[PDB]
Write a protein that holds these residues in place. Structure first.
Motif, PDB file in Angstrom:
ATOM      1  N   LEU A 183       0.726  -1.212  -0.055  1.00 44.72           N
ATOM      2  CA  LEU A 183      -0.124  -0.135  -0.121  1.00 44.72           C
ATOM      3  C   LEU A 183       0.860   1.159   0.117  1.00 44.72           C
ATOM      4  O   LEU A 183       0.512   2.319  -0.187  1.00 44.72           O
ATOM      5  CB  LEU A 183      -0.962  -0.060   1.300  1.00 44.72           C
ATOM      6  CG  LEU A 183      -2.168   1.025   1.094  1.00 44.72           C
ATOM      7  CD1 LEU A 183      -2.958   0.630   0.205  1.00 44.72           C
ATOM      8  CD2 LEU A 183      -2.586   1.132   2.533  1.00 44.72           C
TER       9      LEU A 183
ATOM     10  N   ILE B 290       2.840   0.313  -3.915  1.00 47.87           N
ATOM     11  CA  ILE B 290       1.877   0.228  -5.016  1.00 47.87           C
ATOM     12  C   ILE B 290       1.037   1.606  -5.090  1.00 47.87           C
ATOM     13  O   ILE B 290       1.045   1.910  -6.306  1.00 47.87           O
ATOM     14  CB  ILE B 290       0.598  -0.750  -4.487  1.00 47.87           C
ATOM     15  CG1 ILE B 290       1.248  -2.244  -4.092  1.00 47.87           C
ATOM     16  CG2 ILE B 290      -0.220  -1.056  -5.633  1.00 47.87           C
ATOM     17  CD1 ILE B 290       2.129  -2.996  -5.451  1.00 47.87           C
ATOM     18  N   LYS B 291       1.188   2.221  -3.835  1.00 48.21           N
ATOM     19  CA  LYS B 291       0.556   3.621  -3.992  1.00 48.21           C
ATOM     20  C   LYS B 291       1.483   4.470  -4.836  1.00 48.21           C
ATOM     21  O   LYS B 291       1.207   5.446  -5.589  1.00 48.21           O
ATOM     22  CB  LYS B 291       0.007   4.182  -2.640  1.00 48.21           C
ATOM     23  CG  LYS B 291      -1.386   3.781  -2.452  1.00 48.21           C
ATOM     24  CD  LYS B 291      -1.935   4.404  -1.138  1.00 48.21           C
ATOM     25  CE  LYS B 291      -3.204   4.313  -0.734  1.00 48.21           C
ATOM     26  NZ  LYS B 291      -4.222   4.523  -1.824  1.00 48.21           N
TER      27      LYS B 291
ATOM     28  N   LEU C  15       1.375   3.759  -8.294  1.00 48.61           N
ATOM     29  CA  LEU C  15       0.018   4.389  -8.911  1.00 48.61           C
ATOM     30  C   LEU C  15       0.436   6.011  -9.002  1.00 48.61           C
ATOM     31  O   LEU C  15      -0.104   6.489  -9.962  1.00 48.61           O
ATOM     32  CB  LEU C  15      -0.954   4.143  -8.059  1.00 48.61           C
ATOM     33  CG  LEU C  15      -2.328   4.663  -8.259  1.00 48.61           C
ATOM     34  CD1 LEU C  15      -2.978   3.969  -9.505  1.00 48.61           C
ATOM     35  CD2 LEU C  15      -3.175   4.760  -7.299  1.00 48.61           C
TER      36      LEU C  15
ATOM     37  N   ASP D 119       2.612   6.556 -12.150  1.00 46.19           N
ATOM     38  CA  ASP D 119       2.143   6.463 -13.288  1.00 46.19           C
ATOM     39  C   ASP D 119       0.959   7.551 -13.397  1.00 46.19           C
ATOM     40  O   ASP D 119       1.016   8.103 -14.761  1.00 46.19           O
ATOM     41  CB  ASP D 119       1.246   5.248 -13.286  1.00 46.19           C
ATOM     42  CG  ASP D 119       2.442   4.046 -13.135  1.00 46.19           C
ATOM     43  OD1 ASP D 119       3.491   4.153 -13.576  1.00 46.19           O
ATOM     44  OD2 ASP D 119       1.912   2.962 -12.867  1.00 46.19           O
TER      45      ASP D 119
ATOM     46  N   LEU E 127       0.953  10.346 -16.406  1.00 45.27           N
ATOM     47  CA  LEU E 127       0.051  10.450 -17.484  1.00 45.27           C
ATOM     48  C   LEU E 127      -0.584  11.826 -17.373  1.00 45.27           C
ATOM     49  O   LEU E 127      -1.034  12.061 -18.333  1.00 45.27           O
ATOM     50  CB  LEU E 127      -0.965   9.184 -17.103  1.00 45.27           C
ATOM     51  CG  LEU E 127      -2.112   9.267 -17.707  1.00 45.27           C
ATOM     52  CD1 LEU E 127      -2.512   7.823 -18.515  1.00 45.27           C
ATOM     53  CD2 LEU E 127      -3.591   9.558 -16.861  1.00 45.27           C
TER      54      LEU E 127
ATOM     55  N   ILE F   7      -3.402  17.794 -23.702  1.00 48.20           N
ATOM     56  CA  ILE F   7      -4.143  17.463 -24.686  1.00 48.20           C
ATOM     57  C   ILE F   7      -5.553  17.968 -24.535  1.00 48.20           C
ATOM     58  O   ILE F   7      -6.159  18.744 -25.514  1.00 48.20           O
ATOM     59  CB  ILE F   7      -4.177  15.852 -24.956  1.00 48.20           C
ATOM     60  CG1 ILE F   7      -2.641  15.511 -25.339  1.00 48.20           C
ATOM     61  CG2 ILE F   7      -5.114  15.490 -26.016  1.00 48.20           C
ATOM     62  CD1 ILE F   7      -2.211  15.998 -26.770  1.00 48.20           C
TER      63      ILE F   7
END
Lengths: 49, 195
Positions: free
Chosen positions: A12, A15-16, A19, A22, A26, A33
């Motif tokens: 956690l 993984i967090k 995330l 990412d 992103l 855009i």
């Protein structure tokens, strides 16, 4: 369960972090855009008033 | 002196544009020549007078098939009644970024694509520089030019106009994620499931 708690507690965070990394990679590209397409949409609809 | 037509110099025209189109043996137009402005093209004609037929033939010439434009397939309509073969020629600017070309060097600025349709023969045969080639080479040339026939954004038809008229937000999300690489959305969804 006391021995199991650190193994789940260690999770956690990586993984967090993955995330969040990412999402941080992103987010600006989609944001620029979306901003550019919204600006083009507004400049095209300015003729429509 | 003798009247001379304007030179079709591809260098002046932007890459990917078409300067001169020759339409041979088509409905109500056995021999016709068309010129397209580099900035924008305007064509005025009633529907069913062959202007729509001319546009469909031009679309078919660049590796186009009637069933791949989301419309009914009528090969016979393009062929002149009584003429064995109907010919459509398209000339485009060539740049050294596209592979799988015949009789054309990378430095060459001209890529000429010819489509001939005949009732007797049923096959997809195209011509590059007046040399017979399979449809796969033209289709890959079109794919490498970043132009897509199946996608509704590049080409819009009456059925595509109807589909666009009722468009859901999910369809807009799919179009936006397909224009950019779609791997990022899949990775983010997998990370969300892991979370």
């Amino acid at each position: 369960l006391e021995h199991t708690v650190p193994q789940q507690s260690k999770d956690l965070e990586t993984i967090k972090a993955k995330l969040k990394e990412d999402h941080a990679v992103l987010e600006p590209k989609l944001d620029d855009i979306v901003s550019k397409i919204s600006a083009r949409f507004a400049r095209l609809f300015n003729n429509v008033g | 002196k003798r009247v001379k037509i304007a030179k079709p110099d591809l260098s002046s025209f932007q890459p990917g544009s078409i300067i001169k189109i020759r339409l041979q043996d088509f409905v109500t137009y056995t021999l016709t020549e068309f010129n397209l402005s580099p900035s924008l093209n305007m064509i005025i004609g009633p529907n069913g007078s062959g202007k729509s037929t001319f546009v469909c033939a031009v679309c078919l010439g660049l590796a186009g098939k009637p069933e791949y434009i989301g419309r009914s397939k009528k090969v016979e309509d393009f062929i002149k009644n009584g003429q064995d073969v109907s010919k459509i020629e398209i000339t485009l600017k060539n740049s050294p970024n596209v592979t799988d070309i015949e009789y054309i060097d990378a430095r060459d600025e001209t890529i000429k694509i010819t489509r001939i349709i005949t009732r007797s023969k049923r096959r997809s045969d195209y011509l590059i520089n007046d040399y017979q080639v399979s449809e796969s080479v033209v289709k890959t040339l079109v794919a490498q030019l970043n132009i897509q026939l199946d996608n509704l954004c590049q080409f819009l038809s009456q059925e595509r106009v109807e589909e666009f008229a009722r468009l859901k937000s999910v369809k807009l999300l799919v179009e936006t994620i397909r224009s950019i690489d779609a791997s990022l959305l899949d990775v983010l969804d997998e990370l969300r499931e892991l979370q």
